[PDB]
Curated annotation (Swiss-Prot), chain A:
UniProt family annotation: Belongs to the Bcl-2 family.
Domain of life: Eukaryota
Tissue distribution of the protein: Expressed in a wide variety of tissues, with highest levels in the heart and skeletal muscle.
Motif (BH3): 6-20
Subunit structure: Homodimer. Formation of the homodimer is zinc-dependent. Forms heterodimers with BCL2 and BCL2L1 isoform Bcl-X(L). Forms heterooligomers with BAX. Interacts with BCL2A1. Interacts with RTL10/BOP. Interacts with VDAC1. Interacts with GIMAP3/IAN4 and GIMAP5/IAN5.
Organism: Homo sapiens
Role according to the record: Plays a role in the mitochondrial apoptotic process. Upon arrival of cell death signals, promotes mitochondrial outer membrane (MOM) permeabilization by oligomerizing to form pores within the MOM. This releases apoptogenic factors into the cytosol, including cytochrome c, promoting the activation of caspase 9 which in turn processes and activates the effector caspases.
Biological classification of the source: Eukaryota, Metazoa, Chordata, Craniata, Vertebrata
Domain notes for this protein: Intact BH3 motif is required by BIK, BID, BAK, BAD and BAX for their pro-apoptotic activity and for their interaction with anti-apoptotic members of the Bcl-2 family.
Protein location: Mitochondrion outer membrane
Gene name, Swiss-Prot/TrEMBL: BAK1
Protein name: Bcl-2 homologous antagonist/killer
Residue window of motif BH1: 49-68
């Protein structure tokens, strides 16, 4: 039942993560204007340049979220 | 674009570095309060994950759970 307590604190963290950077993702997507024909190439090099300048869990998270929004952007366009 | 990929990559580096330090303290508090071992880490994680997601799931919550699982693994390895 303490599993709910820890689970509730992750819900706050995740909901805070979900809204804190959601706007910053869409700004990049508008400046990128990605399509199905360039999404893979855009994503792969962006990932390489991000990680070759350093990698940590937060950067992995930021890239995962970017890739998720990038996929949503391409599906809707 | 060419130089464009560096700009977006640098913006993700800022976001990731802000994420990495914004919640790192909140995770370690959870790990100290749970005191997980190799023999209860899986049960701890699965129950926490089910209760987290059954109250709702979004990208941030998936992210928060991944990070918790990563730190939980680091904590168990160190003990
Ligand atoms: C739980 C599974 C743990 C993840 C292991 C995956 C196996 C492949 C690992 C790829 C190796 C790449 C790598 O070494 O990245 C280093 C990097 C270390 O960064 P931090 O732990 O955040 O420390 C920085 C200071 N706070 O590790 C990662 O980011 C792994 C990504 C998490 C998944
Ligand atoms: C597993 C399938 C469960 C599922 O579909 O969850 C939906 C859920 C929708 O949540 P959001 O896209 O953040 O939007 C919420 C409204 N702002 O989708 C997900 O969470 C998929 C997980 C994203 C993976 C992140 C790393 C890649």
């Amino acid at each position: 039942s303490t599993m709910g307590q820890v689970g509730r604190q992750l819900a706050i963290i995740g909901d805070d993560i979900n809204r804190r950077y959601d706007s910053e993702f869409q700004t990049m997507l508008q400046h990128l204007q990605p399509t199905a024909e360039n999404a893979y190439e855009y994503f792969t090099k962006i990932a390489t340049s991000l990680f070759e300048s350093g990698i940590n869990w937060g950067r992995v998270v930021a890239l995962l979220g970017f890739g998720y929004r990038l996929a949503l952007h391409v599906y809707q366009h």
